[PDB]
Design an enzyme around this catalytic site. Structure first.
Site, PDB file in Angstrom:
ATOM      1  N   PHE A 143      29.819  -5.039   5.452  1.00  0.00           N
ATOM      2  CA  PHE A 143      28.522  -4.801   6.081  1.00  0.00           C
ATOM      3  C   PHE A 143      27.558  -5.914   5.662  1.00  0.00           C
ATOM      4  CE2 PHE A 143      29.007  -0.683   8.125  1.00  0.00           C
ATOM      5  CZ  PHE A 143      30.129  -0.149   7.483  1.00  0.00           C
ATOM      6  N   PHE A 178      26.782  -5.172   1.282  1.00  0.00           N
ATOM      7  CA  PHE A 178      27.906  -4.623   0.538  1.00  0.00           C
ATOM      8  C   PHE A 178      29.143  -4.557   1.435  1.00  0.00           C
ATOM      9  CE2 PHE A 178      28.206  -0.490   2.459  1.00  0.00           C
ATOM     10  CZ  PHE A 178      26.951  -0.324   3.020  1.00  0.00           C
ATOM     11  N   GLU A 221      32.404  -1.724   2.150  1.00  0.00           N
ATOM     12  CA  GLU A 221      33.010  -0.434   1.888  1.00  0.00           C
ATOM     13  C   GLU A 221      34.506  -0.603   1.659  1.00  0.00           C
ATOM     14  OE1 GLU A 221      33.505   2.011   5.208  1.00  0.00           O
ATOM     15  OE2 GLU A 221      33.152   3.890   4.109  1.00  0.00           O
ATOM     16  N   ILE A 222      35.024   0.104   0.665  1.00  0.00           N
ATOM     17  CA  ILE A 222      36.438   0.065   0.323  1.00  0.00           C
ATOM     18  C   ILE A 222      37.060   1.372   0.814  1.00  0.00           C
ATOM     19  CG2 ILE A 222      38.095   0.033  -1.586  1.00  0.00           C
ATOM     20  CD1 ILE A 222      36.749  -2.114  -2.823  1.00  0.00           C
ATOM     21  N   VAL A 223      37.955   1.272   1.792  1.00  0.00           N
ATOM     22  CA  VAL A 223      38.462   2.442   2.503  1.00  0.00           C
ATOM     23  C   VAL A 223      39.757   2.949   1.891  1.00  0.00           C
ATOM     24  CG1 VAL A 223      38.972   3.369   4.799  1.00  0.00           C
ATOM     25  CG2 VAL A 223      37.434   1.362   4.566  1.00  0.00           C
ATOM     26  N   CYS A 229      43.067   2.016  -0.912  1.00  0.00           N
ATOM     27  CA  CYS A 229      43.667   1.255  -2.001  1.00  0.00           C
ATOM     28  C   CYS A 229      44.994   1.889  -2.363  1.00  0.00           C
ATOM     29  CB  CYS A 229      42.778   1.239  -3.238  1.00  0.00           C
ATOM     30  SG  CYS A 229      41.473   0.086  -3.098  1.00  0.00           S
ATOM     31  N   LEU A 265      31.160  -0.615  -2.363  1.00  0.00           N
ATOM     32  CA  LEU A 265      30.905   0.820  -2.395  1.00  0.00           C
ATOM     33  C   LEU A 265      32.184   1.550  -2.019  1.00  0.00           C
ATOM     34  CD1 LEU A 265      27.316   1.399  -1.011  1.00  0.00           C
ATOM     35  CD2 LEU A 265      28.139   1.562  -3.343  1.00  0.00           C
ATOM     36  N   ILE A 271      28.646   4.031   5.537  1.00  0.00           N
ATOM     37  CA  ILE A 271      29.894   4.369   4.877  1.00  0.00           C
ATOM     38  C   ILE A 271      30.199   5.821   5.184  1.00  0.00           C
ATOM     39  CG2 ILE A 271      29.752   2.603   3.069  1.00  0.00           C
ATOM     40  CD1 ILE A 271      28.823   4.866   1.208  1.00  0.00           C
ATOM     41  N   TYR A 278      31.880  11.325   1.935  1.00  0.00           N
ATOM     42  CA  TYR A 278      32.971  12.257   1.633  1.00  0.00           C
ATOM     43  C   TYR A 278      32.532  13.220   0.534  1.00  0.00           C
ATOM     44  CZ  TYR A 278      36.336   9.468   4.396  1.00  0.00           C
ATOM     45  OH  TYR A 278      36.998   8.826   5.421  1.00  0.00           O
TER      46      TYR A 278
HETATM   47  C1  LIG Z   1      39.084   3.495  -1.622  1.00  0.00           C
HETATM   48  C2  LIG Z   1      39.555   4.946  -1.693  1.00  0.00           C
HETATM   49  C3  LIG Z   1      40.938   5.021  -2.307  1.00  0.00           C
HETATM   50  O1  LIG Z   1      41.903   4.420  -1.877  1.00  0.00           O
HETATM   51  S1  LIG Z   1      41.023   6.087  -3.713  1.00  0.00           S
HETATM   52  C4  LIG Z   1      42.819   6.351  -3.949  1.00  0.00           C
HETATM   53  C5  LIG Z   1      43.497   5.175  -4.611  1.00  0.00           C
HETATM   54  N1  LIG Z   1      44.927   5.257  -4.306  1.00  0.00           N
HETATM   55  C6  LIG Z   1      45.766   6.200  -4.781  1.00  0.00           C
HETATM   56  O2  LIG Z   1      45.400   7.102  -5.550  1.00  0.00           O
HETATM   57  C7  LIG Z   1      47.209   6.118  -4.313  1.00  0.00           C
HETATM   58  C8  LIG Z   1      48.307   6.119  -5.414  1.00  0.00           C
HETATM   59  N2  LIG Z   1      48.078   5.062  -6.454  1.00  0.00           N
HETATM   60  C9  LIG Z   1      48.100   3.733  -6.234  1.00  0.00           C
HETATM   61  O3  LIG Z   1      48.331   3.223  -5.141  1.00  0.00           O
HETATM   62  C10 LIG Z   1      47.843   2.819  -7.461  1.00  0.00           C
HETATM   63  O4  LIG Z   1      48.015   3.635  -8.593  1.00  0.00           O
HETATM   64  C11 LIG Z   1      46.402   2.246  -7.558  1.00  0.00           C
HETATM   65  C12 LIG Z   1      45.381   3.383  -7.750  1.00  0.00           C
HETATM   66  C13 LIG Z   1      46.068   1.430  -6.310  1.00  0.00           C
HETATM   67  C14 LIG Z   1      46.396   1.274  -8.805  1.00  0.00           C
HETATM   68  O5  LIG Z   1      47.372   0.257  -8.649  1.00  0.00           O
HETATM   69  P1  LIG Z   1      48.387  -0.157  -9.813  1.00  0.00           P
HETATM   70  O6  LIG Z   1      48.956  -1.551  -9.563  1.00  0.00           O
HETATM   71  O7  LIG Z   1      49.459   0.886  -9.918  1.00  0.00           O
HETATM   72  O8  LIG Z   1      47.589  -0.238 -11.268  1.00  0.00           O
HETATM   73  P2  LIG Z   1      47.530  -1.497 -12.366  1.00  0.00           P
HETATM   74  O9  LIG Z   1      48.972  -1.771 -12.756  1.00  0.00           O
HETATM   75  O10 LIG Z   1      46.920  -2.745 -11.749  1.00  0.00           O
HETATM   76  O11 LIG Z   1      46.697  -0.957 -13.629  1.00  0.00           O
HETATM   77  C15 LIG Z   1      45.314  -1.282 -13.840  1.00  0.00           C
HETATM   78  C16 LIG Z   1      44.712  -0.309 -14.896  1.00  0.00           C
HETATM   79  O12 LIG Z   1      44.237   0.938 -14.309  1.00  0.00           O
HETATM   80  C17 LIG Z   1      44.713   2.000 -15.119  1.00  0.00           C
HETATM   81  N3  LIG Z   1      44.584   3.268 -14.438  1.00  0.00           N
HETATM   82  C18 LIG Z   1      43.825   4.347 -14.753  1.00  0.00           C
HETATM   83  N4  LIG Z   1      43.981   5.326 -13.849  1.00  0.00           N
HETATM   84  C19 LIG Z   1      44.845   4.884 -12.931  1.00  0.00           C
HETATM   85  C20 LIG Z   1      45.387   5.435 -11.781  1.00  0.00           C
HETATM   86  N5  LIG Z   1      45.077   6.676 -11.353  1.00  0.00           N
HETATM   87  N6  LIG Z   1      46.255   4.720 -11.061  1.00  0.00           N
HETATM   88  C21 LIG Z   1      46.578   3.474 -11.474  1.00  0.00           C
HETATM   89  N7  LIG Z   1      46.100   2.876 -12.548  1.00  0.00           N
HETATM   90  C22 LIG Z   1      45.228   3.582 -13.298  1.00  0.00           C
HETATM   91  C23 LIG Z   1      46.127   1.573 -15.543  1.00  0.00           C
HETATM   92  O13 LIG Z   1      46.602   2.243 -16.740  1.00  0.00           O
HETATM   93  C24 LIG Z   1      45.769   0.142 -15.911  1.00  0.00           C
HETATM   94  O14 LIG Z   1      45.153   0.173 -17.217  1.00  0.00           O
HETATM   95  P3  LIG Z   1      45.175  -1.109 -18.170  1.00  0.00           P
HETATM   96  O15 LIG Z   1      44.984  -2.405 -17.401  1.00  0.00           O
HETATM   97  O16 LIG Z   1      46.490  -1.106 -18.946  1.00  0.00           O
HETATM   98  O17 LIG Z   1      44.013  -0.920 -19.118  1.00  0.00           O
END
Ligand SMILES: CCC(=O)SCCNC(=O)CCNC(=O)[C@H](O)C(C)(C)COP(=O)(O)OP(=O)(O)OC[C@H]1O[C@@H](n2cnc3c(N)ncnc32)[C@H](O)[C@@H]1OP(=O)(O)O
Ligand SMILES: CCC(=O)SCCNC(=O)CCNC(=O)[C@H](O)C(C)(C)COP(=O)(O)OP(=O)(O)OC[C@H]1O[C@@H](n2cnc3c(N)ncnc32)[C@H](O)[C@@H]1OP(=O)(O)O
Ligand SMILES: CCC(=O)SCCNC(=O)CCNC(=O)[C@H](O)C(C)(C)COP(=O)(O)OP(=O)(O)OC[C@H]1O[C@@H](n2cnc3c(N)ncnc32)[C@H](O)[C@@H]1OP(=O)(O)O
Ligand SMILES: CCC(=O)SCCNC(=O)CCNC(=O)[C@H](O)C(C)(C)COP(=O)(O)OP(=O)(O)OC[C@H]1O[C@@H](n2cnc3c(N)ncnc32)[C@H](O)[C@@H]1OP(=O)(O)O
Ligand SMILES: CCC(=O)SCCNC(=O)CCNC(=O)[C@H](O)C(C)(C)COP(=O)(O)OP(=O)(O)OC[C@H]1O[C@@H](n2cnc3c(N)ncnc32)[C@H](O)[C@@H]1OP(=O)(O)O
Ligand SMILES: CCC(=O)SCCNC(=O)CCNC(=O)[C@H](O)C(C)(C)COP(=O)(O)OP(=O)(O)OC[C@H]1O[C@@H](n2cnc3c(N)ncnc32)[C@H](O)[C@@H]1OP(=O)(O)O
Ligand SMILES: CCC(=O)SCCNC(=O)CCNC(=O)[C@H](O)C(C)(C)COP(=O)(O)OP(=O)(O)OC[C@H]1O[C@@H](n2cnc3c(N)ncnc32)[C@H](O)[C@@H]1OP(=O)(O)O
Ligand SMILES: CCC(=O)SCCNC(=O)CCNC(=O)[C@H](O)C(C)(C)COP(=O)(O)OP(=O)(O)OC[C@H]1O[C@@H](n2cnc3c(N)ncnc32)[C@H](O)[C@@H]1OP(=O)(O)O
Lengths: 161, 161, 160, 161, 162, 163, 163, 163
Positions: C67, C72, C74-76, C78, C110, C141, C144
């Site tokens: 936007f 900013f 918006e992050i939809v 991840c 955001l 945005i 939710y």
């Molecule tokens: C915008 C709205 C959204 O999309 S909100 C929903 C986000 N997506 C999901 O919940 C779907 C399932 N999960 C995933 O796809 C991945 O876990 C996501 C959240 C994208 C993170 O990617 P990933 O590559 O696995 O993590 P990473 O290896 O880069 O780690 C970075 C640091 O973050 C921490 N963390 C704490 N809580 C979480 C969590 N719930 N999921 C993943 N990581 C998490 C990790 O421990 C890691 O910590 P650190 O770097 O060792 O300090």
């Protein structure tokens, strides 16, 4: 004589000469406007002028600038020629301009008025209370530090003319 | 010599070498501004530069980006070459740019000003009070955080050149 | 493998099948989101997605909506695929997304975050203090109820 | 046999006659609004109308103006023809309008309802509590006379149709 | 309510585009042992068509096929119905529309690979393990699968299928 | 380094390609001395033939010249050569892989070739075998049956990545 | 005098080419008196047919009429004649060699033909065999099977210079 | 009493041709009542089909609808009918002979057709046999099967004037 109203602008010969006549009346009745500044705005393409004609001669007008993305119109210049004032010509010009903006569904007028013009706009239904937000006009309408900002809101339902 | 002003941009060989001349002056006089970044903007189509030519040679310029959708213009680089400074070349450059912007209906300049040039911008009418809404420019102008946002309002009835 | 990062979006077969891989990954990792909603956004022309590729196949990405007139993005969506999580991939994705927006003079993210991901956004510098005024983001945005609005502030940088 | 078409004056005789028909149902069920004003809006290119057709013939519709630059849609006219009311047609109309708008990435409705019809909007999900800033709609939506401003938030995950 | 059948494919407008995504989703989910990217490659392949079963604007099934007019048959590539819409005769209705389509385009043989968990559906659609089309005609044109049973269907162009 | 792969061929028109084709003619010809140089040039510069060039620092270091028979459902491998001082480094295997990915994109999933005794080990390592499933009526006379050569076939898997 | 070989036919025009096709129809007919002249003229002027004409001092003294079936990977030999005053001097053999060089450069490696009794030995000496390697499904109903004629096949090596 | 023969078809056709195809669809329909009349219409108006029409005083009294498969080297016989009050007058034979003559000039020399008990004797008198020399791979899935019907073949000789 016979009186005509015509919305014109520099997008024809009689249009060009009518525009020169409007720049003359505007320049004469607004002696603090530099003549070149009047002509620049009057001949500018996204400006329009509501001409008041008496026997093929330009006796008045309202120069304005429509901002339909921002939802309002700028009133740029207002003049009736000296020997034709205090006869309601100004009011028929404003009323005409209002009905035109109904038909283009813009319902807000913004203008700056010095102390000598404030009474006129007041009697055309303008107020100092500006409902349009600053974020929408500042930088698009020409500011005049020293003059009052005035606003008028139209009813897209009542007959103005 | 024979002093000339030209609003150029990359959208002639003569203009191509004037642009390299401006990238050169800007780079030398702004020595911590990365040269590639200066080249990227001076040769950007949406940017334009007001070159100052003395005897066929670029000795100064103001590089800018007009945002006529937002009603202001962003000033990006200002420089005069070392041995031509403190002779008023700066002022005439800015005055010319003001006149160019009156005739284009953009009456607000925005710029960031470091600790080395804010005295110049002050003398050209720039203030720290921003009358443009933060929402008008927050996504458009580059934020040189560390420097001071500064604003110039232009009176379109005054002659500047 | 060969890791690639690309910002892509619906206006080419390669980009097209990449958007389908992205919609697959967003949908499988966010299974209470309607498949057709994710697909409609990912293929929307004024959304973009930063795709993370490993050996020519999508393994994660971030779908976002810029936007500019508002200051900013918006992050939809991840997501990273299940067998490639906990490897820093989510962090490289968000890092690349920051550099992209720093070039483009947008200094604010955001996002709404749920109880399964709020920690990952915290680790990328998001907080619950929203410095963007409500008047800049309301109605832009997708609000939710039930999730937590969070903001990230980017530092601006002069290129090179 | 019931059909729903989003129609409007583009930039087709079956379309043109449906628009004459909608303009008639709006004029008849909203006696306040001048018929000439209803026609300018129904036939404006920036406005659209969702037509409810019962055997080739128009019995209802919703006239709306999309403001995607501002994140909301103005609902200008709502009417079902008198012989067809309290048969659930108004709800089916507003549902289709909602689905049309989640596919087009607009999620707020803004409307002015008179005291006679507030109950219907209330049962379609509208509230008097307006979450959009005043600065976002003032001057785009036609401020209506004595009516109540109402807002409807859409959720792009429900299938409304 | 509001069932429609549409033969689409990638030549695409966004309605057809979003439908191919829906089909790719339904295929991917009901065929877990097929790589998502392979299903996507073929659904979006221009020489491939899909007969979409649309229920209230939303995709609930389909048959992705590939016509080989010069070989005289069609390849049945993917069939699926969404889990909560199965066993209502939707699969049969898709296959019948696909047979009616091919009658008019004068292709009267279907070839498909079915695993042990799909043979019964194709059997009840009139398919047989007896392959009348010669091997020279289909080998290296239709994509073989290891462990799958090759099944053939012959259509009568003098019979109305839908 | 800067290894490039380019599928090229005479079009029935560019000087960079033309000199590449001559490089391929030379590499093929030097690696296969008991094949007439005129015959190798004729095929390389034949329009319904194509070559997959292996470019290293602008210079041709190998390639695979093939003829696609889309109507017959297969491609013939005609020549494979990597230049001598670049052999046994995986270039012949990377060439065959890229050539596999190229054909999956065109729905040709069967390669046929008449390997001589010095090549059978290379083709076997790329997944070729002597068990020919393509019926003889589909390939006979379309490829030349050189007395003493071994007919070898490779089936491609369109679900798996090769590059 | 000056012997020339030209591959001609009745395309989609030339006055010289057209008189030669009459000369060829004349020679074929006179050397094959028991085939109807009308039939010889249909094929010789059929656009999908071509004749390799033997020209001596601007005069037609023999030729070979053939039908290329590129989709089926063979060519049909239809008529062979050398005028009587010019037989037994190697012209029949040069025509066939030239015909071979022509098909090599066009990626066709199989000739098929139905020889009658008086022509078996000529085809035998040009390398034909009664042992047919092309499968029957590839040629049946593309070339014409006359009762009492012998199918004969010739296989071509594209690495061999024929002319 | 003036009799004509025309090869007509829906060219993707003027008034006269259109009303003749409708005639032919009417006649085929009445003489072959186990064929759905919509199926006869689809094939008779199919651009890849053709029909040899028997015209008597501008009136359609018979015809043969055929489908030419030139890549396959044969033609399918789709419908044969003469109107009832014109049958057993030799009309069906002039139709088949005109169709044979038409096909040699187009270098197709095999006919395939299905015939049940009632029609088989007509086709035998036109030279059809239950012994099919066209291999199954060439016609299966190209010609419309009818179970209960006998596949019949006819070989044409191009050194023969059929009309
Ligand atoms: C915008 C709205 C959204 O999309 S909100 C929903 C986000 N997506 C999901 O919940 C779907 C399932 N999960 C995933 O796809 C991945 O876990 C996501 C959240 C994208 C993170 O990617 P990933 O590559 O696995 O993590 P990473 O290896 O880069 O780690 C970075 C640091 O973050 C921490 N963390 C704490 N809580 C979480 C969590 N719930 N999921 C993943 N990581 C998490 C990790 O421990 C890691 O910590 P650190 O770097 O060792 O300090
Ligand atoms: C557009 C940007 C600007 O602000 S331009 C500033 C306005 N222009 C000027 O002042 C130029 C000089 N004035 C004139 O040319 C005329 O007097 C103008 C303002 C155009 C009015 O034209 P005129 O023909 O007299 O109209 P009118 O007869 O309808 O008079 C309207 C009624 O209003 C009252 N009034 C109170 N104050 C004023 C005033 N300053 N000028 C004119 N009228 C004024 C008058 O009593 C008049 O009569 P009534 O009250 O309705 O009975
Ligand atoms: C937009 C982002 C930027 O580019 S900010 C950096 C601006 N550029 C630079 O600092 C580059 C190096 N400096 C220069 O090129 C020139 O000095 C600049 C600033 C462009 C002015 O050109 P110049 O011809 O020397 O100025 P001028 O003769 O017209 O003098 C006008 C009045 O300004 C005053 N001033 C106060 N502080 C400064 C300053 N830092 N640099 C230059 N002038 C300055 C001068 O005293 C002069 O005063 P006055 O007119 O006698 O009252
Ligand atoms: C700014 C946009 C505008 O046009 S504002 C003015 C709205 N228009 C009018 O009042 C025009 C005249 N009325 C009509 O054209 C129709 O009755 C309207 C209001 C459009 C409703 O369509 P209609 O088909 O009758 O309603 P429906 O059958 O779908 O019933 C839905 C539920 O709404 C309820 N409702 C409560 N108050 C009202 C009311 N004032 N008018 C109509 N319905 C109202 C009805 O009881 C109905 O019942 P319920 O939900 O089962 O309890
Ligand atoms: C790889 C090559 C390919 O073409 S894919 C192989 C087949 N695909 C799949 O199995 C994917 C998962 N399955 C599904 O999506 C559906 O169940 C499929 C198989 C498409 C059938 O659709 P559905 O709507 O359930 O069938 P229907 O309601 O018309 O039932 C018809 C009758 O068929 C019979 N049948 C026997 N075996 C099965 C089977 N495996 N799945 C479904 N039905 C089957 C059922 O008894 C059913 O009832 P009835 O016999 O008429 O009384
Ligand atoms: C049909 C076309 C023909 O005329 S057949 C001719 C094939 N070409 C030739 O014979 C020309 C001379 N040789 C060459 O140009 C190259 O050696 C060819 C055969 C192209 C292979 O290229 P190159 O890059 O060296 O091979 P690579 O390193 O990718 O793989 C080597 C691995 O294969 C195995 N191998 C067993 N027998 C052979 C053989 N005859 N030629 C080459 N490799 C062979 C080696 O053990 C080696 O094993 P590893 O997998 O590397 O551990
Ligand atoms: C079925 C429709 C056809 O077109 S049948 C094709 C053959 N044409 C004819 O029979 C028509 C009349 N014959 C001729 O025009 C010529 O004799 C033909 C057959 C074309 C040969 O041309 P000609 O110039 O004599 O060939 P040539 O001098 O190169 O003879 C080469 C060697 O062939 C040997 N040969 C063995 N059998 C035969 C034979 N039946 N006809 C001709 N030559 C034959 C001859 O001994 C001759 O000499 P040598 O073996 O090298 O010492
Ligand atoms: C899909 C299958 C197809 O292609 S259509 C299958 C055949 N059509 C029909 O049966 C339609 C109804 N019959 C007719 O329209 C005509 O009678 C047909 C069969 C076309 C013959 O034409 P028509 O003019 O009557 O025959 P013709 O005078 O030229 O010759 C009569 C000679 O044929 C002999 N014949 C023996 N069996 C039959 C038979 N089943 N149908 C007709 N003729 C038959 C007759 O004995 C007679 O003998 P001869 O040759 O004169 O010595």
């Amino acid at each position: 004589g016979i009186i005509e109203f015509h919305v014109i602008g520099n997008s024809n010969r009689r249009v060009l000469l009518w525009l020169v006549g409007l720049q003359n009346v505007f320049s004469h009745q607004l002696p603090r406007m530099p003549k070149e500044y009047i002509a620049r705005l009057v001949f500018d393409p996204k400006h329009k002028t509501l001409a008041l004609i008496k026997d093929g001669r330009v006796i008045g007008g309202i120069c304005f600038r429509m901002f339909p993305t921002q939802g309002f119109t700028e009133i740029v210049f207002c003049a009736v020629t000296s020997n034709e004032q205090v006869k309601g010509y100004g009011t028929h010009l404003m009323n005409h301009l209002k009905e035109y903006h109904i038909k283009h569904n813009i319902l807000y007028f913004l203008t700056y008025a010095d102390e000598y013009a404030i009474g006129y706009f007041k009697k055309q239904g303008f107020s100092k209370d500006i409902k349009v937000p600053k974020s929408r006009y500042l930088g698009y309408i020409k500011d005049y530090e020293g003059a009052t900002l005035m606003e008028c809101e139209l009813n897209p339902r009542i007959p103005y003319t």
